[PDB]
Amino acid sequence: ERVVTIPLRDARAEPNHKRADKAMILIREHLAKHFSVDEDAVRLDPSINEAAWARGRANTPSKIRVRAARFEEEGEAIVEAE
Amino acid sequence: GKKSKATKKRLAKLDNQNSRVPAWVMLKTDRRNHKRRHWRRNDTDE
Amino acid sequence: TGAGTPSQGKKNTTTHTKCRRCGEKSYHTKKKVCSSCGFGKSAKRRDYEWQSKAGE
Amino acid sequence: TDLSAQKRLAADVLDVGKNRVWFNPERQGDIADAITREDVRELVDEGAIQAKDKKGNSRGRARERQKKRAYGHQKGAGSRKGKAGARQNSKEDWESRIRAQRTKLRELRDEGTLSSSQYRDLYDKAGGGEFDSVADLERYIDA
Amino acid sequence: SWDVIKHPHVTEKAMNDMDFQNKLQFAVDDRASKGEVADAVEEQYDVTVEQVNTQNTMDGEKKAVVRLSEDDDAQEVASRI
RNA sequence: UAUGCCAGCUGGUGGAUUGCUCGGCUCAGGCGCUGAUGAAGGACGUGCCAAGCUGCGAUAAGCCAUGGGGAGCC
RNA sequence: GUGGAAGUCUGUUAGAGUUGGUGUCCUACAAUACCCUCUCGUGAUCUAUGUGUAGGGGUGAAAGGCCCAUCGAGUCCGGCA
RNA sequence: GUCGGGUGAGAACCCCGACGGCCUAAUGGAUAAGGGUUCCUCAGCACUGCUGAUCAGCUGAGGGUUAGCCGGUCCUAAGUC
RNA sequence: AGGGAAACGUGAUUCAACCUGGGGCCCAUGAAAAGACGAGCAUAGUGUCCGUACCGAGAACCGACACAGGUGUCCAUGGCGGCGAAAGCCAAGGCCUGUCGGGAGCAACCAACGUUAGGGAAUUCGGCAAGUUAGUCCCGUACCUUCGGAAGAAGGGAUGCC
RNA sequence: UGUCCCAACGUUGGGCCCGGUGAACUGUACAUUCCAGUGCGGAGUCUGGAGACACCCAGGGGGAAGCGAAGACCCUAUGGA
Ligand SMILES: [Cl-]
Ligand SMILES: [Cl-]
Ligand SMILES: [Mg+2]
Ligand SMILES: [Mg+2]
Ligand SMILES: [Mg+2]
Ligand SMILES: [Mg+2]
Ligand SMILES: [Mg+2]
Ligand SMILES: [Mg+2]
Ligand SMILES: [Mg+2]
Ligand SMILES: [Mg+2]
Ligand SMILES: [Mg+2]
Ligand SMILES: [Mg+2]
Ligand SMILES: [Mg+2]
Ligand SMILES: [Mg+2]
Ligand code: NA
Ligand code: NA
Ligand code: NA
Ligand code: NA
Ligand code: NA
Ligand code: NA
Ligand code: NA
Ligand code: NA
Ligand code: NA
Ligand code: NA
Ligand code: NA
Ligand code: NA
Ligand SMILES: [Sr+2]
Ligand SMILES: [Sr+2]
Ligand SMILES: [Sr+2]
Ligand SMILES: [Sr+2]
Ligand SMILES: [Sr+2]
Ligand SMILES: [Sr+2]
Ligand SMILES: [Sr+2]
Ligand SMILES: [Sr+2]
Ligand SMILES: [Sr+2]
Ligand SMILES: [Sr+2]
Ligand SMILES: [Sr+2]
Ligand SMILES: [Sr+2]
Ligand SMILES: [Sr+2]
Ligand SMILES: [Sr+2]
Ligand SMILES: [Sr+2]
Ligand SMILES: [Sr+2]
Ligand SMILES: [Sr+2]
Ligand SMILES: [Sr+2]
Ligand SMILES: [Sr+2]
Ligand SMILES: [Sr+2]
Ligand SMILES: [Sr+2]
Ligand SMILES: [Sr+2]
Ligand SMILES: [Sr+2]
Ligand SMILES: [Sr+2]
Ligand SMILES: [Sr+2]
Ligand SMILES: [Sr+2]
Ligand SMILES: [Sr+2]
Ligand SMILES: [Sr+2]
Ligand SMILES: [Sr+2]
């Protein structure tokens, strides 16, 4: 378990009206990588969803501090806002 | 629309004819309802 | 307005209906005349020699 | 589990739009067994099924504007969109004025201040649009 | 000569009408009137008919909803057939 | 030696071919009117389960009589 | 000043229509469609249903227009191989 | 649309919640014509569905339309027999 | 009575519906019939027959289709806005089915579209396309004219908030 | 005033790669062509040379006198209207 700061500047690569969506993806990929786990095993707590969609589908925050934990036999992660 | 009593009887009959060939008729004849109609795909008379 | 597809949408009038006399859906409910058997027009049944080849 | 039918019954029993009925997430199983309307009312009392509140537009910002305007503000040239006669109907305004002038003249007469003949002269002049307002009429009466 | 009563119409909705409203439901000849349905029912089960509502069904038949008097008991009537 | 060409082998696909015929086509002989005593035709019903065909008509794949027939039938 | 006329004006009110883009489409969403622009919008107005006029005949403020995707003579079958 | 969750052998698109959105003469409510059971329930996914499908206007089986006072029914219109 | 968890209001303005009047127009004159009223009251009995589901449309209708087309009526008084049944935003209500998704800062090229220095129609058959102007108030307004008009001519100024 | 000088950068949807779904047009045969010539005088296929290792992706369309339609022009028919 640790606190990490995820940069979401790469969402700008996707069309503007769909940034929120790409954000939620970048977040899952970042945790999967930095916690050495499969993306399928990463669980994003709704708190994170709401943070990214706060300004609608086109206005994503440039970064987001997220608190994630790693455990269990198969290896999974649980993440949330902070 | 407004259906008369007679129109209604005919519509009902058509609905009944729209059933399947009973399973036993299958065994007995040892192996289709050629008149199977659909309300949308088809058009009834009148 | 085209005579084709767009003009087909206006068609919701009932004309030809099941005929009391012959059972065909040819009784014109506006004319009250069957185009198939002649009901409403003649006591005799509608018939014509041109409904078949001349020598048959 | 599929609760769309239950949503329809709930909207009816709660007398609200389907979009406002709320089903407790932790009780999908019980709501799913709800077959009858009675089963629905039962769950309603249990609070497992509730009706979200409907909104009403706030009129606060409108009320402030109404005040400023009733006080004569926020109606400068830059705030008008309609033609003058559209902002105030002229025939309608004349009806207001002429009636007020005739009521005035009618009161002065029964009161004794005006003789039926002085009243006539003024009444006919009012009808000819001689006075801009009641005050204008009074000012004239005072010679 | 066609008969008035064809057979009891037995369905969930029919039973409710029987347990809760003292009503019996019948499939009847569609040429029969409400009055002819009342008479026939009284003569067949020796009961007193109070009201009869009819409906020409999408099965090509006529359904009748016969309410008996408080003197009779639908549940018990239908239960003897 | 990949992509691939030609012929064949095993297996498909397809339904030709051969064989078969409850259907046709044509000829010949016999026969020949029905209906208000409501015909022909149609509609809707009618079966334990019954959608189609056939039959039948609220007595609804059937009722009665006489003769035939026969240990099966629905 | 009053009054409120008008085959009157503005108007994507409803509603009717369609100047240009020679835009989009052109094995289409569509055998006549889509978008913007554009015209009419109290009248010779628009519109629903009912009803009448039938083929060398209708109907036509006339374009040989229209009479069920068909018209300088409809459609079907027959004449007919 | 997205995040969680539900059901299921199987879930991007079947259901719940949250967050995010779309429609305001309509993408809402009642209806005429026309359609004809498409309505409701249960069980299903070979068929139909611009992908998938546990879903459905699809398949199987049942069920559903209750009137003295709402229509028809009555009257007559252009006009028809 | 009913309904509501509860309270279970009182006044006012503007007033669709509905009611009732006044005026004007016609080389145009705006149905008929059944029926009803006229013509009281009690109690009782009778009131049969047919329709009744559902869709009513970017999937239930017509268009071969779950077709961006076509298809009548009433909801024309929900809030802000403003002249407004206009735009834009928002309720009630409906929907995420104008139903395939995943991925590449996602190249060329195409469809829609934003911004372009200086020049300013040189482009082109042609200013085609795009743009310029714009609402409201004040000032002011030519030729011509059938005296109606031309006219919003043109041109000039103003516009928020407190 | 990006119509133009003279084009640039950006936005959204496609285009490209991946999963699933999955047509049509067209097809005498052969076919890697190019330059000349020849030929019914407008040849990928004949002749002479030149060039040419096979396969695949993307592209804009030079050629196949490309595909689509038994030329709507013209003439001819002891044709039609
Ligand atoms: Cl009705
Ligand atoms: Cl008055
Ligand atoms: Mg059924
Ligand atoms: Mg289900
Ligand atoms: Mg005036
Ligand atoms: Mg009834
Ligand atoms: Mg008409
Ligand atoms: Mg669709
Ligand atoms: Mg520039
Ligand atoms: Mg030039
Ligand atoms: Mg222009
Ligand atoms: Mg030719
Ligand atoms: Mg010629
Ligand atoms: Mg000639
Ligand atoms: Na149909
Ligand atoms: Na029955
Ligand atoms: Na004979
Ligand atoms: Na059968
Ligand atoms: Na005057
Ligand atoms: Na145009
Ligand atoms: Na002719
Ligand atoms: Na308003
Ligand atoms: Na889908
Ligand atoms: Na430009
Ligand atoms: Na080419
Ligand atoms: Na000709
Ligand atoms: Sr259809
Ligand atoms: Sr026209
Ligand atoms: Sr159209
Ligand atoms: Sr019509
Ligand atoms: Sr006749
Ligand atoms: Sr004859
Ligand atoms: Sr049934
Ligand atoms: Sr006008
Ligand atoms: Sr106008
Ligand atoms: Sr043009
Ligand atoms: Sr344009
Ligand atoms: Sr075209
Ligand atoms: Sr007006
Ligand atoms: Sr035509
Ligand atoms: Sr012929
Ligand atoms: Sr399967
Ligand atoms: Sr349904
Ligand atoms: Sr008033
Ligand atoms: Sr209803
Ligand atoms: Sr509706
Ligand atoms: Sr539509
Ligand atoms: Sr809402
Ligand atoms: Sr789908
Ligand atoms: Sr800028
Ligand atoms: Sr020029
Ligand atoms: Sr020039
Ligand atoms: Sr100015
Ligand atoms: Sr050679
Ligand atoms: Sr290409």
Cβ contacts below 8 Å, chain B against chain C, sum to: 8
Of D85, D83, D137, the residue nearest D114 (C-alpha): D137
Angstrom distance (rounded) from CA E56 to CA E68: 21
Pairing of strands C33-34, D21-23: unpaired
- Alpha-carbon gap, residue C50 to C47, rounded angstroms: 9
Distance of C1' in G44 from CA in D114, Å: 58
In this structure, CATH architecture of domain C1-56:
Single Sheet (2.20)
Residue count (chain A): 82
Query: Is C3 marked as binding a ligand?
Result: no
Look up the domain containing B18 and give its range.
1-46
Instruction: Give Dmax (Cα) for chain A.
Output: 39
**What separation in Å is there between the alpha carbon of E27 and the centre of ligand 35?**
65
**Does any strand F atom come closer than 7 Å to the Cβ of B25?**
yes
What homologous superfamily is domain D56-88 in, according to CATH? Single Heli x bin (1.20.5.560)
Half-sphere exposure of E28 (CA within 13 A, CB side): 26
Indicate the domain borders of chain D.
1-55, 56-88, 89-143
Nearest residue for H18, CA–C1': A46
Please tell me the distance between residue A55's alpha carbon and the centre of ligand 12 in angstroms.
69
Task: For residue B35, give the CATH number of its domain.
Answer: 1.10.1620.10
Task: Point out which residues pair with C17 in neighbouring strands.
Answer: C27
Solved using: X-ray
Q: Is B9 on the interface with E (CB under 8 A)?
A: yes
Q: Candidates 3.40.50.1970, 3.40.50.1390, 1.10.1200.60, 3.40.50.9100; correct CATH number of D89-143?
A: 1.10.1200.60
Instruction: Return the CATH fold of D1-55.
Output: 50s Ribosomal Protein L19e, Chain O, domain 1 (1.10.1650)
Testing the interface with E: which of B2, B4, B5, B9 to mutate, by most E Cβ within 10 A?
A: B9
SS3 annotation, chain D: CCCHHHHHHHHHHCCCCHHHEEECHHHHHHHHHCCCHHHHHHHHHCCCEEECCCCCCCCHHHHHHHHHHHCCCCCCHHHCCCCHHHHCCHHHHHHHHHHHHHHHHHHHHHCCCCCHHHHHHHHHHHHCCCCCCHHHHHHHHCC
What CATH number does residue E27 fall under?
3.30.70.330
